[PDB]
Design a protein around this ligand. Structure first.
Ligand SMILES: COP(=O)(O)[C@@](O)(c1ccccc1)c1sc(CCOP(=O)(O)OP(=O)(O)O)c(C)[n+]1Cc1cnc(C)nc1N
Ligand SMILES: COP(=O)(O)[C@@](O)(c1ccccc1)c1sc(CCOP(=O)(O)OP(=O)(O)O)c(C)[n+]1Cc1cnc(C)nc1N
Ligand SMILES: COP(=O)(O)[C@@](O)(c1ccccc1)c1sc(CCOP(=O)(O)OP(=O)(O)O)c(C)[n+]1Cc1cnc(C)nc1N
Ligand SMILES: COP(=O)(O)[C@@](O)(c1ccccc1)c1sc(CCOP(=O)(O)OP(=O)(O)O)c(C)[n+]1Cc1cnc(C)nc1N
Ligand SMILES: [Cl-]
Ligand SMILES: [Cl-]
Ligand SMILES: [Cl-]
Ligand SMILES: [Cl-]
Ligand SMILES: [Cl-]
Ligand SMILES: [Cl-]
Ligand SMILES: [Cl-]
Ligand SMILES: [Cl-]
Ligand SMILES: [Mg+2]
Ligand SMILES: [Mg+2]
Ligand SMILES: [Mg+2]
Lengths: 523, 523, 523
């Protein structure tokens, strides 16, 4: 059989049925004769292609397959890959290379030194030494992306390889099963369980890999048994816990001193599925105060190595959460009391306070809604004001790279057709990957986009005021008409200049059969 | 406290008491005021430094710490690093850099682009952005080297850093424990156990990570329960099984077709602690024959991803071996019958056949001897003729890089003072790291070196003959006097030109209190 | 024709007729049927292979060709590559790779991520995408090594490529001529000349690229016209000026403040063929004093970019030196007076002072001898006491990496059979590449090796004393018998324990027909 035929049989046998892409000449011999059991999803720029695939992979909890054009396409997507690395997203990134005969002379569209291009943002990066090796290299890419800690991988394939004969022993690849569903040995697990059973004032901190594992319900059982307060680790890419459960204490601020203060007085802090810790602002102080010991369970050896404090165990988050939740004793301590509901801030008949926007969303959205956040000055308020009861309900750029939420919302909605997706995106952030709107229109993927228009890079003004940095250029973004941009890409465009208009426009968007953008005038 | 003082406290708290090194100006601020509870082991060239450390780490089953001089020192050791990568050896390699004030002008002894120098032969490679970061970077190095899959790491440190002030919060680093002692979840382990119990004709294949884990006894119990034959995987860097146990079937030849023929008729093949597979010669054919299913247990995701056939599980070898050995049923089939003794080859009163040398070592050496092999044309006969009953009894260059066994034998002997080390090394292989002899002399480490002098690169001549490659230059190495080389570096020098001389020289070497080299005249 | 045939034709047409190597299986298909118009020079370890080739290239002023074994062989040579980078040595380094069909499974002897292995120490590094590309890739390597600034390059070739068919269009590669023999345009060159003519007290500083270009005599003319003192730039790899010419002022100390003080009072300083500057010790101060302007002519953009002061011109050193020498006016100022003769140090009938050794060599050696220096505590005295009248008379490790001079002296002697080579090497330095001696014995290359045995790493003890660094381990190297090491590799061994013995052994060595090692007992 041909390399083309063998590779599509490997893909289907490993459960792949969708290709996310932006095409070019070096990819045509791969894409021709596209099989009837696969679908292709086009986007207009490569940051958007990768963002869409990333949201699909995160929500589906399975690998996503991507096809890009040589160095130009790969390079246009490297900001997107920065986020995917931080979220442990299982992305199989393929890129077409020039014919083997013209690589040496560096013809136009030759990807020079191709395996080095995406580094350091990938787990594995490779160009095969021969056409017959291509199916084996694809098998390696599928398993490197899928094994814990999951992450993006890169395969460059010369366009002349596809029509050649495959290795006849390639069939052994098709049904390979590789497992990393492992947990701590019985003896040492009993030691950890004893340490939790005897803690006087335990606390729990959960990160994005809990939600990726669907370990949310087991972490609820664990926190109930231990009667422990639960926080989400800073700069949170996902939501790992029901936000109105009595044990929940919210999003930790991303500062050294702020976190040591929250943890003071807790004798044992158990961190599950997070780096220790993803700080942001510089807030110098102690990493931990006297009398607190920390124990981290992580799927990633790089996270375990770099923590400046505590013990660590490297294992699968699903397997570990389930074991712990079923082994710990039921403590007779008092259950934590729920956090108070947020205050309703004053709102006049003019521009909307962000707080008003989140309270309105919470009143009106379905219980199984999925939110995405790229409104960078309003994140603390968002986490306080949205009740998220289910897994897979929140996504935020994992490496802080803007251009994620708009495309990712489209892929999430494709993966979860029965759950309404609502992306809350700032006016500055919207521009980075604006062309992704076209894919939602073309494939009728009914995502709702809420644009928070305050006229400025708000979060930057705030950091500057703090730093006392004066006379800084480039902080304001006046003169962008988001309803016209939505029209430009075929997406229905509504406005909200006051509270009554926000309520009406949201009612309509919830009832719509296609995607909808709402431009909100914010203070 | 200084960066110097903090760093030596981190090392001691993590169990390190020995520095393997070759010094220079950029390392003087690290090495000054050397602590009285540490020991420094000097070698005369950097391939020797790293080989010594590598044998010490493999035999001790714990990390080894190395200090080299900038780019020149690091570069001289990069062949050594190739072996260490393939053996999963936990090596912490440090190198001194120029003072930060002269890095930019590229003064003499500046390590340019330092973190890139040792790649791709290391798990992690780094240069800190400030002096106060040095202790944290050293903690990351220690844990990255020690976590499964174990391996070498690299840290570059500007010489002006050591006298600067350390951060008081570095104390949290000292007692961090990180575990990767994990096994497959109960539900999936029970499925595996059922498959082994149901097999009609199972076989087992063991690799070097069994011996690294001290899982040898558990594998013996597993084989006895399943009544299964046991092979060692090809290109073997270590010995994972007692070589005269009735189940033992020997070293697999390092060829695709050869291995599929051996495994014919076996319905389930369980591989533990090996790559699938480390082939050498090109022996094209089937990876497996029909009706053989393969299941691999490996500590290395890179091995699991690249296997061209079978299922895989990524976990700790010690943990998985113990669990399987204790859970499988006792089979009603008959135990394999032991391999017969090899035949004695005819030997006259002149130059020694390799077979005679191995039979003589087997008759005379202690039952707890430790052997090293770098006699490249005689490996199959070595494996047939030495009875190795105990763990930690054999080492061979894991990446096939010559210059390993001579220095490594010195490090193994330093780690295991109560077990006699005997290194069997070819005349060509002896020269790559010849200056290592000095270190055995200076520290009185009583390794025995058996030089197999056939006058040639024998393995190469054999390869050329198979390919019928004619008129190849550089295959012979006449005119080396190994007794004079030994005297040059202060090591006692004996000869063996016939069988009676060999028996006499071996008896003496076994009785000796210092290192001894024996130059053997072989056919 | 085959790739093998076409590649050897390209090599001979581009003037290459010697292969320096250490062989293995991945290289057998390249080395078989070795052509009658080529010669193979074998060395026992790869640091030695590359050092031999490096001395040969430097003395011959032409590229040298190297063949190594996969990653193990390449890695063993990377300290040698560090020096070659700093000396701008035109080295074409080839390494054999596994067959294409087993690269993906990572069989033994697979060079993983091969092109990244030697970085950052090479100008260009590559693995071809097909067998037919191999001749074009070799043509790229040859020209990249030879173009200004010259330097080392790396090519990895799968062993199955050689027997494959070459493209007939590869014939266009054979006679390609590439020139970088350029100089500054006439208008700007006239501006530079007027500045030199108008200077009241000019000085000149020369570096190794003057000697590589054979620009030495043009620099003498320039100095005589301008009536200018001449210094050699610090950490000098070569000698660019006659050491007893009246303008010569000697080797500059490798310190920032030392150099600005030497140049004080000179209104214009012209640097030719050196980095600005290769400092070593940290000697902080002014880069230049206020009344001094500096102008650098260099063949390397990396040198021009990193200079912390002065104007620069990037051009060919031969072409620029000739132009300047013939355009400048004859000044009416006084020619500098010659440095006085060094004083004779007191010497008893016991161990030799280094000064005595150099005075004796100067008295007895031919006027066209070639010296190599790896006696690291004696360099300043060597430069004062040896009259070197001719080009190509001195070599010193360009990156400070020990293990250069012993092999390089063999390659220089191979390149210049009618000039006596005398390598002055310390007892510590001798061990790094000791096995190189065998190549001098086997090919009867009559280098004289003078071992300076002071029992210690002397330069390190000096550096430690300056730092007041105490309790430093590893500074002494007792117990090495260099006459026995010489005998081990077949090289005649003489001793010199006092002045009368030194005079005798030198007279003998000068008369010898093979290589000779003299072990000198120094203070
Ligand atoms: C035959 O087309 P190719 O050789 O594939 C292409 O690479 C190309 C480049 C330069 C000149 C001609 C074609 C082209 S041309 C091309 C179509 C552009 O269409 P557009 O509507 O702009 O003009 P036209 O073709 O209708 O006149 C694409 C998508 N590509 C691939 C591509 C994808 N993504 C990125 C970032 N860069 C790329 N070059
Ligand atoms: C203080 O802000 P920072 O720490 O600089 C920023 O990096 C950031 C990231 C994540 C969370 C909060 C801030 C942010 S936030 C930010 C402004 C986004 O403005 P937007 O109008 O979307 O929301 P808001 O701030 O008004 O509520 C920018 C430009 N950046 C820098 C940036 C630039 N270009 C790209 C591709 N990614 C980036 N992150
Ligand atoms: C003050 O010495 P440094 O600045 O450390 C050194 O790098 C050096 C280099 C060039 C000139 C002067 C010193 C030197 S000089 C040196 C000692 C050589 O001793 P040797 O006995 O050869 O001569 P001497 O000093 O007694 O006259 C060493 C080990 N080093 C470090 C070093 C270690 N390993 C390797 C591969 N290369 C190296 N250069
Ligand atoms: C068929 O041999 P190959 O596949 O070429 C070789 O790589 C090898 C490795 C492991 C096992 C068997 C052979 C071998 S075996 C070998 C000869 C060693 O001769 P020695 O005299 O030590 O033993 P013998 O063969 O006579 O019994 C060489 C030079 N190589 C290549 C080589 C060169 N330089 C360095 C740094 N490392 C290397 N491995
Ligand atoms: Cl267990
Ligand atoms: Cl809707
Ligand atoms: Cl490298
Ligand atoms: Cl379990
Ligand atoms: Cl003994
Ligand atoms: Cl490569
Ligand atoms: Cl001109
Ligand atoms: Cl002579
Ligand atoms: Mg804004
Ligand atoms: Mg031999
Ligand atoms: Mg010395």
């Amino acid at each position: 059989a041909s390399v083309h035929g063998t590779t599509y049989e490997l893909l289907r046998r490993q459960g792949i049925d969708t290709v996310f892409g932006n095409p070019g000449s070096n990819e045509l011999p791969f894409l021709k004769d596209f099989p009837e059991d696969f679908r292709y999803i086009l986007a207009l720029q490569e940051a958007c292609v990768v963002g869409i695939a990333d949201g699909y992979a995160q929500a589906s909890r399975k690998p996503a397959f991507i096809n890009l054009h040589s160095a130009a396409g790969t390079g246009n997507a490297m900001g997107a890959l920065s986020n995917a690395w931080n979220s442990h997203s299982p992305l199989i990134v393929t890129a077409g290379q020039q014919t083997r005969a013209m690589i040496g002379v560096e013809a136009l569209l030759t990807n020079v030194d191709a395996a080095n291009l995406p580094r350091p943002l990938v787990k594995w990066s490779y160009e095969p030494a021969s056409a017959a090796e291509v199916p084996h290299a694809m098998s390696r890419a599928i398993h490197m992306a899928s094994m814990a800690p999951q992450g993006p991988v890169y395969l460059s394939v010369p366009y002349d390889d596809w029509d050649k004969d495959a290795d006849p022993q390639s069939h052994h690849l098709f049904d390979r099963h590789v497992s990393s569903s492992v947990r701590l040995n019985d003896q040492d697990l009993d030691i950890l369980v004893k340490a939790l059973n005897s803690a006087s004032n335990p606390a729990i901190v959960l990160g994005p890999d809990v939600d990726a594992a669907n370990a949310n319900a087991d972490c609820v059982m664990l926190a109930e048994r231990l009667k422990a307060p639960v926080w989400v680790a800073p700069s949170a890419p996902r939501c790992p816990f029901p936000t109105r459960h009595p044990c929940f204490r919210g999003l930790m601020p991303a500062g050294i001193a702020a976190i040591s203060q929250l943890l003071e007085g807790h004798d044992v802090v158990l961190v599950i599925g997070a780096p220790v810790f993803r700080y942001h602002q510089y807030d110098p102080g102690q990493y931990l105060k006297p009398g607190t010991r920390l124990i981290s369970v992580t799927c990633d050896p790089l996270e375990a190595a770099r923590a400046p404090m505590g013990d660590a165990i490297v294992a699968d988050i699903g397997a570990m959460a389930s074991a712990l939740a079923n082994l710990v004793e039921e403590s007779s301590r008092q259950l934590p009391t729920a956090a108070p509901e947020p205050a309703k801030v004053d709102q006049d008949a003019g521009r909307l306070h962000p707080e008003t926007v989140f309270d309105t969303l919470n009143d009106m959205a379905p219980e199984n809604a999925i939110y995405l956040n790229e409104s960078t000055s309003t994140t603390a308020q968002m986490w306080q004001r949205l009740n998220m009861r289910n897994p897979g309900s929140y996504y935020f750029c994992a490496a802080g790279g803007l251009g994620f939420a708009l495309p990712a919302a489209i892929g999430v909605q494709l993966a979860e057709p029965e759950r309404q997706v609502i992306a809350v995106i700032g006016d500055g952030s919207a521009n980075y990957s604006i062309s992704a709107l076209w894919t939602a229109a073309q494939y009728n993927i009914p995502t709702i986009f809420v644009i928070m228009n305050n006229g400025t890079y708000g979060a930057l003004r705030w950091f500057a005021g703090v730093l006392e940095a004066e006379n800084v250029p480039g902080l304001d973004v006046p003169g962008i008409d988001f309803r016209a941009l939505a029209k430009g890409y075929g997406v229905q465009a509504l406005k909200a200049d006051n509270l009554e208009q926000l309520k009406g426009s949201l009612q309509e968007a919830l009832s719509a059969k296609g995607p909808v953008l709402i431009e909100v005038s914010t203070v």
